[PDB]
Design brief:
Blueprint lengths: L12 H17 L3 E9 L6 H16 L7 E4 L5 E8 L2 H18 L4 E2 L4 E2 L3 E8 L6 H18 L3 E4 L2 H23 L2 E10 L5 E12 L3 E3 L1 H10 L3 H20 L8 E4 L2 H4 L4 H12 L6 E6 H4 L3 H12 L4 E5 L18 E4 L1 H4 L6 H16 L3 E4 L5 H10 L3 E2 L10 H7 L3
Parallel strand pairs: 6-7, 9-11, 11-12, 12-13, 13-14, 14-15, 15-16
Antiparallel strand pairs: 1-3, 1-6, 2-3, 4-5, 8-9, 8-16, 9-10
Helix pairs in contact: 7-9
PDB class: transferase, hydrolase
Keywords: Tandem GGDEF and EAL domain, Diguanylate cyclase, Phosphodiesterase, GTP, c-di-GMP, Transferase, Hydrolase
Assembly: monomeric
Length: 425
Amino acid sequence: MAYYDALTHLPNRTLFQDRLHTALQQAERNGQWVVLMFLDLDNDSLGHAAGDRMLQEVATRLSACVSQDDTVARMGGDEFTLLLPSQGDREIALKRAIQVAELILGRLARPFTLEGREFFVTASIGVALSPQDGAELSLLMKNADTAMYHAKEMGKNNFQFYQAEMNARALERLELESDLRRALELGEFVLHYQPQFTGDGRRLTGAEALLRWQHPRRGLVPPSEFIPVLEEIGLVAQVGDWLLAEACKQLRSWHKAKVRVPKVSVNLSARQFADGQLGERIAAILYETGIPPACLELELTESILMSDVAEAMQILSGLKRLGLAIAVNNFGTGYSSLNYLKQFPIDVLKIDRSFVDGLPHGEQDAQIARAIIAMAHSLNLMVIAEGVESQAQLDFLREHGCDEVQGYLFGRPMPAEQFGMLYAS
């Protein structure tokens, strides 16, 4: 009438089925996703302590690999199973499965000492995802077992998803994460510049710096592809640091040659905003280049400000103490969330394109914008809109008081030289 495994203190086929079924019904109601993992480890001879003892160690390792709502179990022999339930969507479930899989492989890569000597262990994993690889327990298990057998016949110390989609995906992510790793050391990062104009569109008020990746096989990569991954792994600080140096050194270069760009706007991410050396670095750059901090505008999202308000207060304070302007961006609206930015030392409000896309044919968008502009004005903030495509948008914005503007109606982002030439005087 057993419920768990004696040897490993891990649940057993009966309970992992009850919890899998349970999590599947749960995922069926709450419309969520479920990660099922099958693990095979690869007693003789002379091995019956190792089988007893190795299995235990592997179970200890497996437990320390996945989250508590998650479940590690054993289904006889060398074979273990994992359950990662309550996943929001296919994306985060895929990612979670990846992380769990390759940590397990790295854990099990660790030596085992049993009968006084070291021994290594191979493990092959197959991963199936509900409700896609099966809305049902037995089907999902058949398919996870299948994926494990493919992973197995393919080699040792590897994992494979049931769907080829996920494998190709994972591989691509690995390639991206590796090439990204080389890029900065190599020097494959270049800065493009989209210019900012007055609400009317006459005089130039600045230049937004945009990070670009000049990959010699992929040419220039789409930021939407590499920027997330870049920030997802701890690389976004050194790069962001090079960036800053380059942008300041450009403004200074620009001003001293053929171009008057009164300021440059650089956007920051979660990590490099919370990077404790941001001030020591920015002050050092501002020092070396020789440009007034007012000519450097830093840009943030609300998601970044409101993730940790208490921290944001201190970083933003320490940054304003330099003399530079703070810009804030994107999501709402959601108006006294304007109230919420009142509590900060901000100088600039920046309207995301998702608001301008409805201008001025979408009346709600037209009026929502108009609200944003007025209330941002009330807090003495500068308002600039992004994604100005048509004259119909530009006209509206200028006729309603949007101080600055930027977008594609004025052209595409470009290198610094061509920038300095396209707005030389």
